[PDB]
Amino acid sequence: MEAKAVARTIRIAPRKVRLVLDLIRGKNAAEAIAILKLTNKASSPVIEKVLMSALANAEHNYDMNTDELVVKEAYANEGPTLKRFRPRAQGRASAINKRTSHITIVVSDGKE
Amino acid sequence: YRKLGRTSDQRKAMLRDLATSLIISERIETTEARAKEVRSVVEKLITLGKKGDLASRRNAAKTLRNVEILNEDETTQTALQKLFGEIAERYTERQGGYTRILKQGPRRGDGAESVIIELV
Amino acid sequence: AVPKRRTSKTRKNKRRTHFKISVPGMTECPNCGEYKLSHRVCKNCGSY
Amino acid sequence: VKRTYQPNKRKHSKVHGFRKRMSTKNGRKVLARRRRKGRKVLS
RNA sequence: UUAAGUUAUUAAGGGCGCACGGUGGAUGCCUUGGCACUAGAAGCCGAUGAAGGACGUUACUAACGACGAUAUGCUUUGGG
RNA sequence: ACCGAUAGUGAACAGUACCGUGAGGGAAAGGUGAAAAGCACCCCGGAAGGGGAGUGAAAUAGAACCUGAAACCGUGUGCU
RNA sequence: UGAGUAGCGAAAGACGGGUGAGAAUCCCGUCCACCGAUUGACUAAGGUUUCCAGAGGAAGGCUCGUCCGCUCUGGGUUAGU
RNA sequence: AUGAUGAGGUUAAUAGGUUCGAGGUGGAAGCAUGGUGACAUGUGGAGCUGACGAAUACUAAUCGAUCGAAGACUUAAU
Ligand SMILES: [Mg+2]
Ligand SMILES: [Mg+2]
Ligand SMILES: [Mg+2]
Ligand SMILES: [Mg+2]
Ligand SMILES: [Mg+2]
Ligand SMILES: [Mg+2]
Ligand SMILES: [Mg+2]
Ligand SMILES: [Mg+2]
Ligand SMILES: [Mg+2]
Ligand SMILES: [Mg+2]
Ligand SMILES: [Mg+2]
Ligand SMILES: [Mg+2]
Ligand SMILES: [Mg+2]
Ligand SMILES: [Mg+2]
Ligand SMILES: [Mg+2]
Ligand SMILES: [Mg+2]
Ligand SMILES: [Mg+2]
Ligand SMILES: [Mg+2]
Ligand SMILES: [Mg+2]
Ligand SMILES: [Mg+2]
Ligand SMILES: [Mg+2]
Ligand SMILES: [Mg+2]
Ligand SMILES: [Mg+2]
Ligand SMILES: [Mg+2]
Ligand SMILES: [Mg+2]
Ligand SMILES: [Mg+2]
Ligand SMILES: [Mg+2]
Ligand SMILES: [Mg+2]
Ligand SMILES: [Mg+2]
Ligand SMILES: [Mg+2]
Ligand SMILES: [Mg+2]
Ligand SMILES: [Mg+2]
């Protein structure tokens, strides 16, 4: 079948998380863990914590074989932003966006 | 040679503080580019130890700091005596080398390539 | 000094076609463990 | 560079504050206008 | 086999259409609050210390209401 | 034959947050469900979040809780 | 949108050990460096709990954060001169 | 600038070190002697030396992984 796991309101901005997220889609799960431990972006241990959760759902809730699974989907949606300010010069301020993300990966065994 | 992002007087001080603690502890952990430079400094300092006369004892004291080692069995020796006492014994047959560099991954706060340099 | 027109969605997306990232080296720890980085030392989850 | 509003505790209570408003007729007018808006702090 | 000629195949990325999601809070439905008026009473208290406020009061207490060292209320007469 | 939350009182939750030395100026912010029955228990995780299970007529009704448009951000794809 | 662009607010750090899911950035130690008619020590205005202990890591901190002038709980100012 | 370019990757002199040189500086430390002493002389063209030259596997360039063709049709000579 398919299993999934999402992580909602992650403080990293969505453009920054989609870079590392493009390396792992379409690949099987053993390679995808090895990639996320060796890229030094800040997003990498957050995605890797999510992919662990989706593998554990397939073993427990659905009784799949974890040795042969592939990543079907991996994507990141926007969450709500936090609006801050920063004082610039001559009494003027500027706006700063603290972005958030919802991360979703699904995993499957390719059969019906 | 490299500049290491420091001024001329700061680079000299950082490079002989770094070479002293490699004599004390015999393997330390630092960045890649700093370990490439202390490679040649500490091996020119073992060459002074293998000669062993007074005039090179005076010349190695230009570089090392004044650090006491709490040696085992409650004895205590300086860092200069430990260079002419033990390291000069182990490398009396070898003709260079004396050090090696082993790479590791980046640190978290930077992308700085960590490196262990050891004394062989 | 300031942009005269906005940039459309296509021209923005054609610009960041090289704004990518590459896969790392990924050798193996042959003695015991998972994959390590090439020319590095398999310290954790590794024996090489 | 020195700014305006160098604060002082005696002076603020003496050009403003309750007893100074009560001592004139026009000071009593401003207490009546702030009771009519329902302003929480008077003087 | 050689010459001359014609025509294919790629999509790093982009465009159109379709499907599925997210953010965001329009629209619809609603009302706890308001606006304008009618009829009938009544219009302004105070040195016997006012209007308006400050401090406090609940077993556990931050704000609002009520109350005042008899303090999150007391007595009596009638309802229930 | 007045308004229905950008309306109608500035104010449906305030002359308060806030600004000003001061007179003074002055906001924003409504809606789970019939009933709280408001997710026992298991699994990943340091937690936050989530997948199952269960309540319920309905949980893409889970408290940032009716309906959920558009801008905008993404993932797949048929023709190019 | 500009755009992963400008900027991240004068200055010298290095190593070891520890704690922790996690450490350039927290604690301990050694060396090094800066001020020193002052980056030292007192007292006034002014501000009003920012003081101390223990616990914490959503927001704040121009990075990180196991830390904090931040959050929670509880404590603390004593005069005949 | 980055990237590209070029020299090399153990069947190896790519870099570092070690040894020997070039060139630069100009007579080390210690000891002895003379001098009241400041100092001078000898040991000794000494000692020190970044980038330059040659030799030497002492240290490190490990193990590995990825991409990459399978000669279309028509006609005329052969
Ligand atoms: Mg964060
Ligand atoms: Mg200013
Ligand atoms: Mg100087
Ligand atoms: Mg793109
Ligand atoms: Mg593509
Ligand atoms: Mg009357
Ligand atoms: Mg009764
Ligand atoms: Mg209104
Ligand atoms: Mg509405
Ligand atoms: Mg004020
Ligand atoms: Mg309003
Ligand atoms: Mg939970
Ligand atoms: Mg629905
Ligand atoms: Mg919403
Ligand atoms: Mg309804
Ligand atoms: Mg809704
Ligand atoms: Mg860039
Ligand atoms: Mg530009
Ligand atoms: Mg630029
Ligand atoms: Mg910059
Ligand atoms: Mg700074
Ligand atoms: Mg440390
Ligand atoms: Mg310290
Ligand atoms: Mg000084
Ligand atoms: Mg001070
Ligand atoms: Mg005071
Ligand atoms: Mg404190
Ligand atoms: Mg503490
Ligand atoms: Mg934090
Ligand atoms: Mg932060
Ligand atoms: Mg902890
Ligand atoms: Mg505090």
| Technique used | cryo-EM
Chain B: partners with 3+ C-beta pairs within 8 Å: A, C
Domain-by-domain residue ranges, chain A?
A: 1-112
d(CA A15, CA B78): 55
C1' (E33) to CA (D37) span, angstroms: 21
Strand G: which nucleotides have any atom within 7 A of a protein Cβ? 1-2, 4, 12-16, 22-25, 30-33, 45-47, 58-64
Exposed/middle/buried for residue A51 (C-beta within 10 Å: 0-12, 13-18, 19+): buried
β-sheet with B99-106: strand ranges across:
B27-31, B113-119, B99-106
Best CA proximity match to A58, nearest among A50, A70, A66, A68: A66
Bridge partners, A95 (sequence order): A85
Indicate the residue type of D33.
Answer: R
Three-state DSSP at B70 gives: strand
For chain A, list the strands marked E by DSSP. Answer: 2-10, 70-78, 82-87, 93-98, 101-108
* Cα B59 to the center of its chain, rounded Å: 15
d(CA A2, CA A109): 7
Instruction: Please identify residues in chain B, positions 74-103, with a C-beta within 7 angstroms of any atom of strand G.
Output: none
d(CA B92, CA B86): 10
Torsion angle of alpha carbons A42, A47, A49, A52, nearest 10°? -150
Three-state DSSP at A4 gives: strand
Three-state DSSP at A38 gives: coil
Q: Token match 């992580």: residue?
A: A7
Chain A residues lying within 8 Å of B105, measured CB to CB? 38, 40
Chain C residues lying within 8 Å of A23, measured CB to CB? 21, 23
Task: Count CB pairs under 8 A between chains A and B.
Answer: 4
CB B23 within 8 A of CB B79: yes
Residue D39 Cα to ligand 11 midpoint, Å, equals 18
CB B23 within 8 A of CB B64: yes
CB B86 within 8 A of CB B66: no
Give kind and range of the element (H or E) at residue B36: helix B32-51
Number of H helices, E strands in chain A: 3, 5
CB A80 within 8 A of CB A100: yes
Are A38 and C34 inside 8 Å of each other by CB?
no
Residue A10: other Cβ atoms inside 10 A: 20
Domain-by-domain residue ranges, chain D?
A: 1-43
- b/e for D5-33, b at 16 or more Cβ within 10 A? eeeeeeeeeeeeeeeebeeeeeeeeeeee
Best CA proximity match to A43, nearest among A74, A12, A71, A22: A12
Please tell me the CATH code under which domain D1-43 is placed.
1.10.287.3980
* D5, closest nucleotide (Cα–C1'): F21
Sign of CA pseudo-dihedral A45, A46, A47, A53:
positive
D9 touches strand G (CB under 7 A): yes
Which residues neighbour B116 within 8 Å (Cβ) at sequence distance 6 or greater? B27, B28, B29, B101, B102, B104, C41
d(CA D4, CA A109): 73
* B94, closest nucleotide (Cα–C1'): H58
d(CA B1, CA B38): 11
| Tokens standing for residue A87 | 């004082």
* Cα A55 to the center of its chain, rounded Å: 14
Three-state DSSP at D15 gives: helix
CATH T-level assignment (fold) for domain B1-120: 50s Ribosomal Protein L17; Chain: A, (3.90.1030)
Best CA proximity match to A56, nearest among A25, A29, A18: A29
C1' (H40) to CA (B16) span, angstroms: 39
CB B64 within 8 A of CB B83: yes
d(CA B53, CA C9): 76
> The CATH number of A1-112 is which of 1.10.3720.10, 3.40.50.1950, 3.40.190.10, 3.90.470.10?
3.90.470.10
Q: Give the closest residue to G9 (Cα–C1′).
A: A88
CB A64 within 8 A of CB A109: yes
Residue of C nearest to B114 (CA): C40
Residue A52: other Cβ atoms inside 10 A: 13
Determine phi and psi for A60, rounding to 5 degrees. Answer: -90, -50
Residue A36: other Cβ atoms inside 10 A: 23
* C7, closest nucleotide (Cα–C1'): G1
Angle at A25 between CA A19 and CA A26, to 5 degrees: 150
d(CA A21, CA A2): 19
C1' (F20) to CA (D5) span, angstroms: 12
Indicate the residue type of B27.
Answer: R
CB B85 within 8 A of CB B67: no
C1' (F71) to CA (C12) span, angstroms: 18
Q: What is the resolution of this structure in A?
A: 2.7
Which residues neighbour D17 within 8 Å (Cβ) at sequence distance 6 or greater? D43
CB B19 within 8 A of CB B41: yes
* Cα B4 to the center of its chain, rounded Å: 17
Three-state DSSP at D31 gives: helix
Residue of B nearest to C25 (CA): B105
Query: Do β-strands A101-108 and A70-78 pair in parallel, antiparallel, or remain unpaired?
Result: antiparallel
Indicate the residue type of B88.
Answer: A
Indicate the residue type of D42.
Answer: L
Domain-by-domain residue ranges, chain B?
A: 1-120
